[PDB]
Amino acid sequence: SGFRKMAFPSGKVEGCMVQVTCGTTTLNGLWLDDVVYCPRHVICTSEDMLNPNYEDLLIRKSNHNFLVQAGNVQLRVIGHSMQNCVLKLKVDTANPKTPKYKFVRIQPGQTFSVLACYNGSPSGVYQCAMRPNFTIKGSFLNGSCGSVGFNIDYDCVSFCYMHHMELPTGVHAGTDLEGNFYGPFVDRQTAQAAGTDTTITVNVLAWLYAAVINGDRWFLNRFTTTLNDFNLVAMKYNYEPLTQDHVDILGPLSAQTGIAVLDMCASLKELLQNGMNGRTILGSALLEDEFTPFDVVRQCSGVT
Amino acid sequence: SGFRKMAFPSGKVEGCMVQVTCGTTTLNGLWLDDVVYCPRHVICTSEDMLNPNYEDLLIRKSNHNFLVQAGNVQLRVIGHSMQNCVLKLKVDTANPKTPKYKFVRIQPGQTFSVLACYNGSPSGVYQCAMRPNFTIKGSFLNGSCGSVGFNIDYDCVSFCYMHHMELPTGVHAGTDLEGNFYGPFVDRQTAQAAGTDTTITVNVLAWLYAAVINGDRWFLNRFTTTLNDFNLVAMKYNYEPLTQDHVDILGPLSAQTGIAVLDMCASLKELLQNGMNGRTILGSALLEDEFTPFDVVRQCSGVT
Numbered sequence: 001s002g003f004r005k006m007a008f009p010s011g012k013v014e015g016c017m018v019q020v021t022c023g024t025t026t027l028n029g030l031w032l033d034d035v036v037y038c039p040r041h042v043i044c045t046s047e048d049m050l051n052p053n054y055e056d057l058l059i060r061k062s063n064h065n066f067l068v069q070a071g072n073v074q075l076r077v078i079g080h081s082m083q084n085c086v087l088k089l090k091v092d093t094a095n096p097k098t099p100k101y102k103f104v105r106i107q108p109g110q111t112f113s114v115l116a117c118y119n120g121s122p123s124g125v126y127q128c129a130m131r132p133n134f135t136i137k138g139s140f141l142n143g144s145c146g147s148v149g150f151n152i153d154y155d156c157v158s159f160c161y162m163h164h165m166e167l168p169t170g171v172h173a174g175t176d177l178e179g180n181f182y183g184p185f186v187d188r189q190t191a192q193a194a195g196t197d198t199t200i201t202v203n204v205l206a207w208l209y210a211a212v213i214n215g216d217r218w219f220l221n222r223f224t225t226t227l228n229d230f231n232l233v234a235m236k237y238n239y240e241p242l243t244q245d246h247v248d249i250l251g252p253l254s255a256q257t258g259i260a261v262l263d264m265c266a267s268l269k270e271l272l273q274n275g276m277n278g279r280t281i282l283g284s285a286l287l288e289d290e291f292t293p294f295d296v297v298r299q300c301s302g303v304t
Numbered sequence: 305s306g307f308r309k310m311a312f313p314s315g316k317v318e319g320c321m322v323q324v325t326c327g328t329t330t331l332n333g334l335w336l337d338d339v340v341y342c343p344r345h346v347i348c349t350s351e352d353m354l355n356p357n358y359e360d361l362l363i364r365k366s367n368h369n370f371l372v373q374a375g376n377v378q379l380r381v382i383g384h385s386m387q388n389c390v391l392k393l394k395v396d397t398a399n400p401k402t403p404k405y406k407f408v409r410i411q412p413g414q415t416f417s418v419l420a421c422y423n424g425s426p427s428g429v430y431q432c433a434m435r436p437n438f439t440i441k442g443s444f445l446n447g448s449c450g451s452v453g454f455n456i457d458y459d460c461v462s463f464c465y466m467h468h469m470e471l472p473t474g475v476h477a478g479t480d481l482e483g484n485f486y487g488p489f490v491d492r493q494t495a496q497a498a499g500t501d502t503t504i505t506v507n508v509l510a511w512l513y514a515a516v517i518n519g520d521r522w523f524l525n526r527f528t529t530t531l532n533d534f535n536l537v538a539m540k541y542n543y544e545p546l547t548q549d550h551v552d553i554l555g556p557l558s559a560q561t562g563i564a565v566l567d568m569c570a571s572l573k574e575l576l577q578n579g580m581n582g583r584t585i586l587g588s589a590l591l592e593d594e595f596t597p598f599d600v601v602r603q604c605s606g607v608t
């Protein structure tokens with residue numbers, strides 16, 4: 001028993017972190033096979049900043065301007081290309097610690113672990129969600145750019161995120177490993193405001209299931225609801241609309257706990273309309289929305 | 305910016321996790337040099353359970369009854385001894401991945417990362433505190449015993465915790481790596497109730513500092529207080545008494561933010577007396593107490 005916000009073991013990804021220095025800029029790169037991936041803004045300076053023309057900036061860069069260091073050993077850069085907002089530095093040595101890996105573009109509501117790094121050295125690991133507004137609520141200081149977000153399926157790391165941008169509101173933006181930003185965000189120091197940070201309804205329900213499974217049951221009530229009725233209450237409270245797909249996704253948790261999804265929706269509805277009344281659910285005073293149904297099943301079953 | 309509940313990178317510790325099987329019991333061991341550490345209850349059965357005499361139970365065990373498996377390779381057990389509530393299995397091979405390590409007995413309020421494992425395979429990593437009642441609020445299913453809690457100081461892992469017991473209230477108990485339980489707890493299926501789960505006052509303050517440092521400032525007020533006045537309010541709310549040592553420990557954070565510790569105490573006092581009024585601090589609706597002052601400094605500075 002016990003339910004905890006749990007990151008994947010970072011080992012496989014620690015073995016992929018290098019330092020990338022271009023000029024006076026130092027940040028993090030991912031080393032997979034003979035390619036190192038980093039944010040293209042590594043090449044930026046004091047001024048370019050507001051409106052860097054990355055293609056033009058890059059013309060002034062050679063292979064030898066990209067200093068790539070794996071612990072205390074330098075990697076030889078034998079090629080460099082720009083793919084969207086990431087650089088791909090070809091090194092002459094394949095990372096011997098390259099795990100099985102995929103690059104996946106996650107959807108909003110999907111969760112992942114982030115290995116926070118500075119100078120290609122891992123500092124910590126935490127669990128995130130891609131927010132419905134395509135931000136993430138991270139922990140990222142200067143030098144943390146190139147830190148990646150990932151999922152592990154047993155021995156295969158699925159990289160979903162590279163850190164690029166802090167918004168003036170102190171939320172975070174970045175790319176998949178093809179260098180495409182999540183959401184409308186750009187690697188440019190400009191007026192970028194996040195949209196509404198909506199709650200991931202399906203995740204709150206998953207977490208309501210995890211709670212029951214671990215003995216926290218006070219919020220179970222006698223009520224049920226429909227999708228349409230529940231979604232009126234979701235709207236008012238800036239919750240993602242709940243779809244039959246979401247109900248379907250909660251099936252297993254429904255099954256195991258013998259609580260119908262729509263009954264749990266009615267439990268969530270009362271929590272929204274009435275608050276927690278100073279009580280807690282799995283040691284939280286608000287409705288957690290960064291556990292997927294998959295995350296709950298994983299942690300409640302004990303998958304490795 | 306952003307502040308997140310952050311575990312240490314698990315890599316160094318993943319490389320230390322093996323499976324220990326005695327009879328039909330499978331749980332986790334720590335492999336450091338040529339010794340594997342596991343809970344002594346690995347040798348327990350259906351009945352012993354309520355009052356196992358571990359010395360007597362162990363007489364019926366030989367080296368060859370302890371099956372130790374590192375991934376898909378078996379380790380040869382060449383000796384076994386009981387140290388308090390852990391077993392130390394001598395293997396014929398030193399773990400090639402043994403990091404620099406220490407065994408440290410932590411104090412209540414001290415935080416650590418736990419690598420949740422099943423069958424010597426890491427499932428996840430989360431951050432814990434040793435509670436003032438010597439419990440931890442973990443996530444531990446069957447097979448998770450022998451999972452360890454640790455801190456890293458750069459390249460040196462300080463192991464502080466091995467998982468042994470779930471209390472009927474679904475909180476967790478275990479030992480340091482010398483096999484001594486934190487608190488009054490025993491590896492025996494009996495009436496063990498946790499005492500009052502008090503809040504780690506110094507940690508809440510550290511976290512109040514982390515908040516200010518990351519822009520969450522609404523709870524700053526015009527008030528100050530004394531230790532004695534603040535401690536009357538702490539008592540009433542089951543908070544650890546705050547000592548000058550704690551004030552001293554918060555010095556650096558005081559310095560950096562230019563908020564006197566006693567002013568922040570007065571901020572915490574009003575939060576206790578008035579609640580959050582439906583507001584949040586670093587995306588929490590209650591007062592987080594599993595960040596040390598050291599943890600705040602680390603994450604706010606970016607130590608690796």
Ligand SMILES: *CC(=O)N1CCC(C(=O)N2CCCCC2)CC1
Pocket residue numbers: 025026027044045046141142143144145146164165
């Ligand atoms: C997120 C990260 O690590 N970054 C690298 C540093 C960079 C920065 O601070 N500057 C200032 C000096 C000129 C380049 C940009 C911000 C992004």
Ligand SMILES: *CC(=O)N1CCC(C(=O)N2CCCCC2)CC1
Pocket residue numbers: 329330331348349350445446447448449450468469
């Ligand atoms: C915490 C852990 O992993 N443990 C190992 C399993 C054990 C258990 O379930 N049993 C039942 C069968 C007889 C031995 C005890 C509990 C501790």
